Amino acid sequence: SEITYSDGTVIASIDYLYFTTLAEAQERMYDYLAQRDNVSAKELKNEATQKFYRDLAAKEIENGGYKITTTIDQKIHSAMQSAVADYGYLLDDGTGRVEVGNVLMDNQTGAILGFVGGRNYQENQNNHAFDTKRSPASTTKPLLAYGIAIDQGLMGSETILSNYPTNFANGNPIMYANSKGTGMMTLGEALNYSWNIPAYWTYRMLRENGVDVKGYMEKMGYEIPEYGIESLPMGGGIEVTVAQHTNGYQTLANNGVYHQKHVISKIEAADGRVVYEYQDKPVQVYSKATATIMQGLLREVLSSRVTTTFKSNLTSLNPTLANADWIGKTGTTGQDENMWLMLSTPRLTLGGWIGHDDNHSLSQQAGYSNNSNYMAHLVNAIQQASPSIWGNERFALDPSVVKSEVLKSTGQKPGKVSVEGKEVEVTGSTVTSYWANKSGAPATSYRFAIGGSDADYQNAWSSIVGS
Amino acid sequence: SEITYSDGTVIASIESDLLDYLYFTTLAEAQERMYDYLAQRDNVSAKELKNEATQKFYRDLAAKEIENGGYKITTTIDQKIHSAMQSAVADYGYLLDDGTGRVEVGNVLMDNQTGAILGFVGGRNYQENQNNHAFDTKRSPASTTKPLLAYGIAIDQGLMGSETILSNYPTNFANGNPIMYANSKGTGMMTLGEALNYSWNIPAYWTYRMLRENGVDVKGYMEKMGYEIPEYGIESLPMGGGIEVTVAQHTNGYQTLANNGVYHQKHVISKIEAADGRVVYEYQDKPVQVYSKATATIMQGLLREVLSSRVTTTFKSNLTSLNPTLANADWIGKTGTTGQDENMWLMLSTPRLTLGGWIGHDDNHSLSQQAGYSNNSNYMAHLVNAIQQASPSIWGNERFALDPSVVKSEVLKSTGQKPGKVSVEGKEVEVTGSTVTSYWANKSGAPATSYRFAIGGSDADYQNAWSSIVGS
Ligand SMILES: *[B-](O)(O)CNC(=O)c1ccccc1Cl
Ligand SMILES: *[B-](O)(O)CNC(=O)c1ccccc1Cl
Ligand SMILES: [Cl-]
Ligand SMILES: [Cl-]
Ligand SMILES: [Cl-]
Ligand SMILES: [Cl-]
Ligand SMILES: [Cl-]
Ligand SMILES: [Cl-]
Ligand SMILES: [Cl-]
Ligand SMILES: [Cl-]
Ligand SMILES: [Cl-]
Ligand SMILES: [Cl-]
Ligand SMILES: [Cl-]
Ligand SMILES: [Cl-]
Ligand SMILES: [Cl-]
Ligand SMILES: [Cl-]
Ligand SMILES: [Cl-]
Ligand SMILES: [Cl-]
Ligand SMILES: [Cl-]
Ligand SMILES: [Cl-]
Ligand code: NA
Ligand code: NA
């Protein structure tokens, strides 16, 4: 039995590359054998059956004469190994040795071209790309809060949300770093800064409208045991591998269309019948309008440089590659335990995590600076190895996107609002807001933003009233 | 006659003209030193020397003396470094072109302890454009003025400390126009750290306004650093309004802050000696304490955060990517941007060196929006690295640190002054809250909180501020 690269080159006969691809090879054989023997999912639920079928899948691979075709690009995977050997030291920050996981994924197929499993398989065998699960934190926000709210037509690109101080149900303040919050802001600013309260209100709105949020997340392969959590949009109650989470940003980057992640393409018996072949099941999870609007937002998350120095780092390493159409989002857990940076061009998504195996804190700036700088170095290694793999294509608004002229101040169409009895003529600076519904944005009404108390609205309307 | 590098290697021999940047700059300055020495030797008075045909005669005589004579001219120019600077601009200059044309450039590397100029960049390519953008060009230093003319003086005079609050509330010039910053009429109260990081304008306006109300001799300070500003009675002076400088002079103001407040006059010539042994000129060390050590070291701490905040420069990010270990040196700096983005400045120091940097167009037209935020910052990280590669210890590993004379005060985040009770317009109030350490350069430290706790701000501003404070 043999395991090969995408081109056919032998990886090995039956150091992360071996164990990862063999393991997935095995899971594939497992499904196949259980299918071959008509084991129902009840018996499959059973633990000693599980052990038996696992063992049988493994021997079937050793004893069989199987050709196992992987999706791994040798040059690219190899360059990624070198990148982490050469530049992994950039992660270490005086909190101990910082572990890393990266998965490089073709956005149009979901194939995985290469990955980084950890700083050094010899030193530490944990596989941080495929096995370790950590809260994805704020990188949850585009997928589960904002993207869904837009796809449902509850929100456009320049909609306003409350970042006024507010409490969880226990009465503790919702915090972001040191801040209890500020006031109204646009989706764009909420996203660039990664504020927490606007995300809380958004998911709260989705529950109020009874939106099938599980539907969305499950179509991307996400398994979240409990959706009834106030901090869910922030990453609370969620734990994901780098591979699975990469698959989510693949969905946004591929114009809303999911392709299931995979590292095994084909398994052929000695006589050459396919025991397993990868079967494309493209799923439209977000509308093309919603995914393309989200792309324009996530472009500016990087551009703005508020929570990541990535675009600066990359410019200094390779100004040409800095000009590809990068979009992305960062994540940071509450005690700086885990940092994420997810990056896409139209062709590829590169998911990246860092943290400690025992879950203890990183440095304040581990995500903003170190992982950003390490990931720029990695992206540049992938380029050198395979020089047009990223592409210079641009993300663009889908024709079905609807434009609205809204007031900058309310994110809604200008007109008459009643403000404590005195009805007023809301006028002023306007912007183009992008929506994914039919009618675009509504007329401005008193409760114009996502979230906010009465005290907040009093206060906010006061400022707008300074006409 | 020969001009050499600091180590004695010959840059060039000087011959009469028939009828790069490095040659003409050093020659032009050698000539200025010979001018001084000839007027001297002939006892011409500096009033006699205001006679204009007399400038001409003594300038021509100084040119001739060098041409004819057998003079050894020792410059301060470090050959490997200067050479690395010329390669860096040739290799990375293109990073400055942003779509508005051929972006010109001036850089001056200075030793903070002596004022010696180790190297410079005169421009993009002497053979295409001979204008010397390091020594000749004068442009507004824009916001890079603020630490020198506004905040550093106010701290020095005891009128403000590291965590003093200043107004950024909307305010007008005397002519009724709003003071603008980018596109913003302003915000509210903010710390000195925030005013400096974002480079707001209203806090500098109020700072200079204070200095003027106090009768502070701002001119005294600036002139001790060699700055020539014809009119100090300008509202926007602390933003760079009514100031034009060369990169060499302006690098010298930053050298003064970096050197714990002690100015050394910039120079490119260290010695002229004749074949017979006469030393016709030798650089005389003349250190001047322009700001106190407490002020300069306080200012150093704030300028460290200007760069690390990355608000108006990507520099520390660019440099981290090029050379992480070099990025860990103790960098401090300030950016400048003129109103229409005509001119971008970035000034950088470690304890050992100051590197000034300007970009812009010879004809003064606009650069792109991010020319200084990103392009200059990235080109200068490349320059700082090339200097490093040429001379790996030259930037040094020393840290900037508070002088012992600095006075520390425990102060309210919200007011910048000691906690206590305040006349909040009938209803005496007890001000409590978040505490921070504030550094002062005086004897006594910060005040107890007064009603008017900030630099600047109207009656209505203070109603607004105090209302929001009290809400605890
Ligand atoms: B975001 O990563 O910028 C901020 N996220 C959080 O604060 C978050 C992360 C994990 C669990 C819960 C929360 Cl609120
Ligand atoms: B600073 O460069 O960030 C802001 N400075 C200016 O706005 C300025 C520049 C030159 C002349 C006058 C002004 Cl206000
Ligand atoms: Cl590997
Ligand atoms: Cl391959
Ligand atoms: Cl809580
Ligand atoms: Cl749900
Ligand atoms: Cl999952
Ligand atoms: Cl639920
Ligand atoms: Cl697979
Ligand atoms: Cl950018
Ligand atoms: Cl609709
Ligand atoms: Cl030169
Ligand atoms: Cl004066
Ligand atoms: Cl001057
Ligand atoms: Cl005056
Ligand atoms: Cl000189
Ligand atoms: Cl002689
Ligand atoms: Cl830093
Ligand atoms: Cl940056
Ligand atoms: Cl005190
Ligand atoms: Na984040
Ligand atoms: Na500036």
Side-chain angles (χ1 to χ4, degrees), chain A residues 425-442:
Chain A
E425 189 67 278
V426 201
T427 171
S429 297
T430 69
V431 289
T432 306
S433 196
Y434 302 132
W435 291 68
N437 61 350
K438 281 329 145 80
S439 59

Side-chain angles (χ1 to χ4, degrees), chain B residues 212-246:
Chain B
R212 271 182 77 95
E213 265 147 27
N214 269 288
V216 178
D217 183 5
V218 165
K219 178 194 245 175
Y221 282 95
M222 290 310 124
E223 288 192 337
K224 283 201 233 302
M225 292 179 287
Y227 289 103
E228 298 180 50
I229 289 158
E231 177 55 77
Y232 280 84
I234 288 163
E235 286 156 284
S236 62
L237 180 81
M239 288 101 96
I243 305 170
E244 270 175 11
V245 302
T246 65

